[PDB]
């Protein structure tokens, strides 16, 4: 029940490396049951190269095309972060952005080490917000 893309990038003087995961889903509910593969690949035994920190991005696509009720909306969405701050416990996650579709309405909850959710960046993805 989980569709995964992997992210891989680095800092261009934004503020070295980290990975990410985006998964596209129908309802936010289905995610938290479909939780367990996102945390599955967070893999391969340790290697020993030659002789001689939150690092996960998370964006979730959601549907059910709801409307104005940002309070009841994001509050429900928010208490997923506050119920499992475990995300922070699993070697920390940089960002949890919730994306609800119809342009996509973002519900950005970023807690790399932080409070769950940032208010300036709601309705926008902070990589593109840099513009």
């Amino acid at each position: 029940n989980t569709c995964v893309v992997e992210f891989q990038f680095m800092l261009p003087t934004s503020h070295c490396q980290r990975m990410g995961g985006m998964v596209s889903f129908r309802t936010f509910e289905d995610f938290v049951r479909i939780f367990d593969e996102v945390m599955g690949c967070f893999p391969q035994s340790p290697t020993f190269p030659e002789a001689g920190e939150p690092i996960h991005i998370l964006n979730v696509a959601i549907k059910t095309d709801c409307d104005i009720e940002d309070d009841r909306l994001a509050a429900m969405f928010r208490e997923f972060t506050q119920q499992n701050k475990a995300t922070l416990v699993d070697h920390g996650i940089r960002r949890l952005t919730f994306l609800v579709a119809q342009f996509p309405k973002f519900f950005t909850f970023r807690a790399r080490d932080k409070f769950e959710e940032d208010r300036i960046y709601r309705h926008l993805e902070p990589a593109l917000a840099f513009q």
């Binding site: 939780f35 367990d36 599955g40 699993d90």
Partner: protein, 214 residues
Amino acid sequence: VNKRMSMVVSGLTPEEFMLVYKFARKHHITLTNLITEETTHVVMKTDAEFVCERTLKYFLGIAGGKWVVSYFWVTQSIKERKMLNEHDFEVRGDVVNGRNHQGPKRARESQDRKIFRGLEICCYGPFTNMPTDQLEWMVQLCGASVVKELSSFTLGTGVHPIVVVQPDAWTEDNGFHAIGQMCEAPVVTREWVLDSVALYQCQELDTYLIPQIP
């Protein structure tokens, strides 16, 4: 030297074993395929009410007083991104011998009064789904003195010899009904031991006694 963490699993599909291995993988926890004295935790596949199947590792786990926990403890610590407490998911029983017989639980907390302490058990081959030497380890773990051959039975009033057979494994012969003529010991099916082990309480032989020929 101190003991290390060590889990074994039972009743899992292949895809499911990797999840326990993955749990063991993250925290370098020992995970074996044969249950031994070095094995410390036994992970059982259960339903929502922490009721499991009867496997070789379940019985052998009880005999050794090892931590017998439900497989749902593993999925939940990963599922919730925390390191939850194993004890909340301990299995309480099975679908044959009772829904709350607390066999595994009593065995861990009662290793000082093993159910077969002071009993002499002969593991009478052949066996299916359970090696003879593993059943011997089981009764060994339960305080019984293992007797390898019928002539080695102790003769005495204070000794309690018991011949344990599995009627199911025999198909060519009815020989298990004649041991009582050859020795002084009750003859019961292996399920008496397994049930006694499954419950960790020495059951009364009455329902499991095997008829002898006078």
